[PDB]
Subunit: 223 residues, 6 copies
């Protein structure tokens, strides 16, 4: 994180041990369920690419996921190389360099350069750029670990509607495709994969029903 010095040097505080302990505990305990993403987007606000690399390397568990994330980062860096080419020239008066793909990450970048690159006006936010690429690979990571496709979940013989809605929406959160298909999923197969008695009552309500209405309608009905 960036902080101003008393005199003012635009200096960097080392990440707290508590944040790393919390992140490691979250990754270890929660496997790679979808809440890792908001948690990462919370523990790393304003963090430099060195801090993000520190949190990434601090993990010593599911190394396959970390390597796939590294491959995604490399692909996104390669993509970044093409979009903005090299300036092809000497240093402009009082001007620092332009971020390369590897420069965005902490591989080919000193801490002072990253300090400068996000504290100059106009700002090149290398931290948020690295965060976006990490999140985009964590998306795939969370997708791979869900052991159910959305078109496979149906509520059992003796099970409350509450548990079904929980499971269905957990799977829906895991299986990110797009907003339109998410709403289509919600409005069509929630009712069409239930218990025949639950099917009957849910059809009895009809279309255009909020989830609260569906939940209160099936409350107790089905036991």
């Amino acid at each position: 994180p960036i902080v101003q010095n008393l005199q003012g040097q635009m200096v960097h505080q080392a990440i707290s041990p508590r944040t790393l302990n919390a992140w490691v505990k979250v990754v270890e305990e929660k496997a790679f369920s979808p809440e890792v993403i908001p948690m990462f987007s919370a523990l790393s606000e304003g963090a430099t690419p060195q801090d993000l690399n520190t949190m990434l390397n601090t993990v010593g568990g599911h190394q396959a996921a970390m390597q796939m994330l590294k491959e995604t980062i490399n692909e996104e860096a390669a993509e970044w190389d093409r979009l903005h080419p090299v300036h092809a020239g000497p240093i402009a008066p009082g001007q620092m360099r332009e971020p390369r793909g590897s420069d965005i990450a902490g591989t080919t970048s000193t801490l002072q350069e990253q300090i400068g690159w996000m504290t100059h006006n106009p700002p090149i936010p290398v931290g948020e750029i690295y965060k976006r690429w990490i999140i985009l690979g964590l998306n795939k990571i969370v997708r791979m670990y869900s052991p159910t496709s959305i078109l496979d979940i149906r509520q059992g013989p003796a099970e409350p509607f509450r548990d079904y809605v929980d499971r269905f929406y957990k799977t829906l959160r895991a299986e990110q495709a797009s907003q339109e298909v998410k709403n289509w999923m919600t409005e069509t197969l929630l009712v069409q994969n239930a218990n025949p008695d639950c099917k009957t009552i849910l059809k009895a309500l009809g279309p255009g029903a909020t989830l609260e209405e569906m939940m209160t309608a099936c409350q107790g009905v089905g036991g």
Copy 2:
């Protein structure tokens, strides 16, 4: 939260990991008992819509409640759209835009715009507005999870009056209707739902009795 900078840039400190850990633990362990609401209204004082979204997304348990809460937030935002229409014009001299319904949430709003919207004079408190909508959906969430309606609780044959009063008032807190019906419920069903011996003693005291007198009257009386 909003905190002034040393020079003064009106900058935002990232929410503490401890607060999110406490919030997640509370939601997990305590299910959705009525104590979630006062705790949420405490752990998120002055928080930006981004912080509220972070707390809302950090949980990975009861996804049905969070989806119903999201639907409630969408409804409240749609309601917000109608009440305040669009200015229909260019940017006024030295003036930022007006918060839309989605702008109140963090969906279509950058952190800097939210920072600006809540420190300009006069202030548009987007944080408090989003907090009210979140509380208005947590109310429904807490209502749904109480597994007993108020007119269904009756004190057992061998049970102290203390436990009955605890259960009755917990249910009364769960089932929010309005102040007057709460008072009428307290003054009419507490006595007319107890143990027959408890019925007799409460009849012996009579009406217009504070809860303290009711509790001390039956202390030991009924075992």
Copy 3:
């Protein structure tokens, strides 16, 4: 709590989650034993009425005690209404309103008004006034939960005098009446409720003996 701003705008700090967790844990584990009162008077130093309401509402256990405490607040607010009437007039030059009974609590009061009321010279100590009313109801609450009146305790056949003195003084703390009768209790039924051999030795020392002398007298004597 009141905390000053760098520029100075008479601003308010939210209570740390640690204090709420500690208060909730104390109430949950310690029932309503007498040490709750000093604990409340310690964790809420300088706290605004909104903070006190947060601490009270965060509790989700013994709801009967919470409702009794709410009735006590209502009675003490009704009492407060009579003592200081309404000024019956318009706003005086540069003057804020006079706190009512409800305004003393957090029901009919905004945080900014509470800030203003407790930081202007001369100061209206709204927070301490609410604290006193809360403590006065916690007194009744603590009295109700002691499962022994003071004139029922007598030392067991084979039990050290230390345990007896512990129980007697715990009950003495619980049963608050008034100082002189407390002293009379101490100086009269410490001796005249004890074990027959203990009765004899305490008679042997005689009157006007400090608690240290009484404890050292029966050390080992009685086993």
Copy 4:
């Protein structure tokens, strides 16, 4: 403790909940062993008499000891009343009152008066004065709870000399009388209460030997 204000008002910081929890946990877990005293003299550095009263009241365990401590405090305050009489006159120009015995404690003293009394030049250190009287009663209290007089510690038949030295010096710490008799105890009964083989070897060394030599001599000798 005392904390200076940004403008400078000589304001008071409330004790952290962590310190109260640590003090309560120490009193609970460690009984009333002699280590309570250094712990109290540590957790209460610079604390006002209100803070000391808070720490004393927060515990609801060994209530007999707390009454003993209160009686000792009252005696010490009564003693203080005699030594410093009443000024017998009106208020001197720009002068606050002279603390009484009760004013030294928190009974008859508001927090502001205590704040003033310890921040004026020359300083009346009411905090340290109250700390000394509390420590003086804690001395007696810790003496009472040691369940062995010093002249009863004789090392068992098959037990290492190290355990004997530990027990003997623990009792030596507990039984505080005066320095010279402490050294006499150390130099006379440590050797004259041990195992006859340990007695023999200790006699073999002779007098004027440091305790390190005492353990290194008997290391293993006696098994």
Copy 5:
């Protein structure tokens, strides 16, 4: 770490006990697995050589690795002696000495000298140099404790490909040789060590397949 004083003396903050506790716990629990390196590179940011020596000495577990690391530091200090020789002359006007190899560590160096050596312009960052030598020896330590060479890993008859990729990449992380040979390892022995059926699918996809494709290909295929 480095902190500036209010007046400005460029003074040294002692490392919090929490950091030492976390580092000791990490070294104890995680043995000498590869996550120790990012852990040390994170918990010691900006630390003076005295802080690094404190972290090194605080642990009392695997003393063999600690002696190995000390020998590595001695070798790297001896190497440092040759590269930069002695200035061979008196003190230059307003100039401090040029660090020796042992001066880089905390053996022959006062804390104030290291303070001066790192706050002067141009900076001699003794902390970073000591950190690099510690890291280079921790690398050998982590290499020694991996109980499998890379060309010995083969996934069993009934085992998911996920566990194999985890184990293989953990081993690859442990066995650092160089980037090119790591890539070569990844590109041919991941597939040429699997289950014969898994061998069939991996052959079926063909070369030039990202790790994500390899994982999704054999998902469930092989049970």
Copy 6:
């Protein structure tokens, strides 16, 4: 610890409860293994002798070690008395007294005199002098509690060389004599105390080998 005041009074920050809890836990759990020394030298950076006395007195376990360390402090203070005698004269213009042996410790010294003695230029670092004497006695403390001399450790018939190196170097750390004999011990009895087959392979390597070669050579060789 020393902390400058806002106005500037050079006032003393009270030691944290967390540090004392950590120190007490370390002493209790870790007995008196050599890791107590670096941990003590880390948890007490810049601490005044009052803080050191607080940490020492907070211990209530191995009281024999505490008394021996107290005698060591007394001896070191007596030694200190001889080296620097008394000035034998009145107070010099604007000069404070000279630290005596007891003055170095907290026995005959108020906190303010210690505050002055280490803040005035030139500085008399009383705290560091007390730290050195305490460390010198803790050295004997750790030496006494090691239940093995260095020339008594021999590795068993069936035990990995790693465990032997750990044990041997732990004992080596415990038994401090001098650097030369330490190196001689390392290079002469590490090999001459192993398992016959381990003896043969160690002979096969030969002299002039760093610990790394012995560790890798016997990896698995001996099972």
